[PDB]
Write a protein that binds this ligand. Structure first.
Ligand SMILES: [Cl-]
Lengths: 220, 218, 216, 219
């Protein structure tokens, strides 16, 4: 698995609240030098990301990181991001809604954002480490099926901000089996080495969210 | 030094975890009425069931990252107020402030001010990030911008940023910057009575607490 | 009915695109002199009405806005102090038979205004002219299903016209005693007013209220 | 004097009735392609089905009244563009223009501009109202506000205001004020091929029509 090949799986990411336009400009330069698939930035940073290169593939987050926004608000955010040049959107579910068993609500929340972006690649962050710690494997699968039923293109493990943690190979395996190659699976959160990255791919991930991409690639 | 009832009267009793359910919020409301606190603070989608649960309600906007365009923060804040929130605690774009874009921070806060009508508007400045990454003057500038944009409070912290939560130095700087014309809400990591009293003595006029019972027993 | 009793049914209304803050202030002054129930103004004028009981409109007059936008608009008005919101349905949605869509559109606004009085403009003159009585009734029931407090006849801007006695009578028969019924559009005389109240209206939307009251 | 295909290329083929259905919109799109128009113009909730109809889509914002706070207009514009609209035709608050609050009109336009990114933004000044209720200089000031706020076009009318729609005089004034830096769209009550060509001769670079076929047949 080559350095260029692993890099083609990667969304090179900066989501810190303190991030400046200059930070986002350096992120895009580093992404181009590394040969990654996209940059992932916070919604108001999309103009800066688009302006920092030619033909930059930009993903933005929506309803992030808490998931605790009403659906209209997540949709509005996603639509402004697409209007500013975002090709993809990584939204967060209402994690508390999943845990209460309101799967209809989770599915409708994702369908609202789906209807607003239209053209864009939509990834749904299920916060798998939170679902697996506070409920069970079954709950994770149900959330994945809601994402599929609502028209999502990816299910995605983690925000990288929840204290329960990030991607596990078990979560990815569970998520990959549930969507069965019909949707992509993005592993994210705490992927810090080459070995972490390869193990997520081996478990079924078809995309990786990384902030320390160079160090991951250097490990090869 | 204040009694239990007096300390409680300073408090916004808070649950903002991503995993919070309606049942968690209903238990939070019941516990706030027992403790005699000033308000509950809940996430925007939980406002209707907090309000209906029979307590003054605050909500958050652009929370916790602050990385949302103004129009998204304003839309969120309008919905929460229309659903019955009495107060909104919004987060600034911390990066905008670090880059020196103080007119943009102010316009961001003005958009929210215009959406909430007469509701109490608190601006979370993420003081521990501003003091870690810039300097005292930058914290003062952000506060003044909040007052210029029509805020009613300046507020230290989200409780979610790794730079930490409320500090005495941050609270005192903020209280001087607003000169008693706005409130100062100290929040994030306030776990004991001594923490609480240290912030009120530094000039806080409201406290954001998640573990209020343990502070009150104090 | 006395002058005072008839006024008590009225939402005293200015919705013209050219309306200024000064026009809105004269409308409120006139409202309070006439003893009306409420003033009805356009969403950006709500702050000036409140600072001078206020109803505002939402998704008005076309009804052609996505649900989230109507809900955003309604919430902003309530936040600036509107006690009531009068929204417009996607009339074309109702005519295509998409009553689930119309209901969902109304429930979105319902969930965004909290405790506000929510009135749903069904554009009854268009529904009767382009569909049928049964469609008008189905739209009213969707409004009830979605949690609305009132059904209302007309924007006063649709070419098909305004309130008719039959539309109001149908709407009152269908949801009367459970939802209020507001007759609006083309109510120009005392006799028009009284004919809508007799048909089952419990609120009236008027622009020329003084003239209507004078005819008693 | 333009050929049929040339006149058609100036046209936004439009359906904005409250009663319009998805089926009405799909017929509109089919007719648009047949006629060779520049674009179809539809109401915001109709954009996704107009885009999916698979042959350029414009939508409107804060239409037709202009009486919506800026944030609502901007929200509405964003959604339409995210659903594939290439252009947005917004409506100013006409009463704000009349009250002399041109800074507020400018800010209202700037709000929509920052929501749409790169889309073509047209600003509807409701010229027939500005001329009937104010004066010519007010029309010019509103055009300047639009330019200053980053609009790509100024545009006469909604076609729903009782003071009427496009006039030769309105179009000449607007085209003078923007001086070829913005486009000028003539719209509202353009009933004949003669009406259309008089607007074009007055400086319009785009035409909003509903009865497009009957206009083109007049050539
Ligand atoms: Cl002619």
């Amino acid at each position: 698995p080559t350095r260029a090949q692993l890099a083609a799986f990667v969304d090179h990411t900066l989501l810190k609240p303190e991030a400046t336009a200059a930070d986002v400009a350096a992120l895009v330069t580093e992404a181009a030098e590394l040969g990654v698939y996209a940059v992932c930035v916070s919604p108001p940073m999309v103009p800066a990301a688009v302006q920092a290169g030619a033909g930059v593939r930009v993903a933005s987050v929506a309803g992030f990181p808490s998931g605790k926004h009403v659906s209209a608000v997540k949709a509005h955010e996603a639509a402004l991001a697409v209007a500013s040049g975002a090709a993809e959107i990584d939204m967060v579910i209402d994690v508390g809604a999943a845990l209460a068993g309101d799967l209809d609500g989770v599915r409708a929340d994702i369908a609202a954002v789906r209807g607003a972006v239209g053209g864009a690649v939509l990834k749904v962050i299920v916060e798998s480490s939170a679902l697996l710690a506070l409920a069970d494997e079954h709950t994770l699968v149900r959330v994945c099926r809601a994402a599929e039923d609502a028209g999502a293109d990816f299910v995605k493990t983690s925000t990288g901000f929840h204290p329960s943690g990030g991607a596990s190979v078990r979560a990815v395996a569970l998520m990959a089996e549930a969507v069965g190659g019909r949707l992509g699976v993005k592993a994210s959160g705490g992927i810090r080495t080459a070995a972490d990255a390869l193990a997520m791919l081996d478990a079924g991930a078809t995309r990786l969210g990384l902030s320390g991409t160079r160090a991951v690639l250097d490990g090869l």
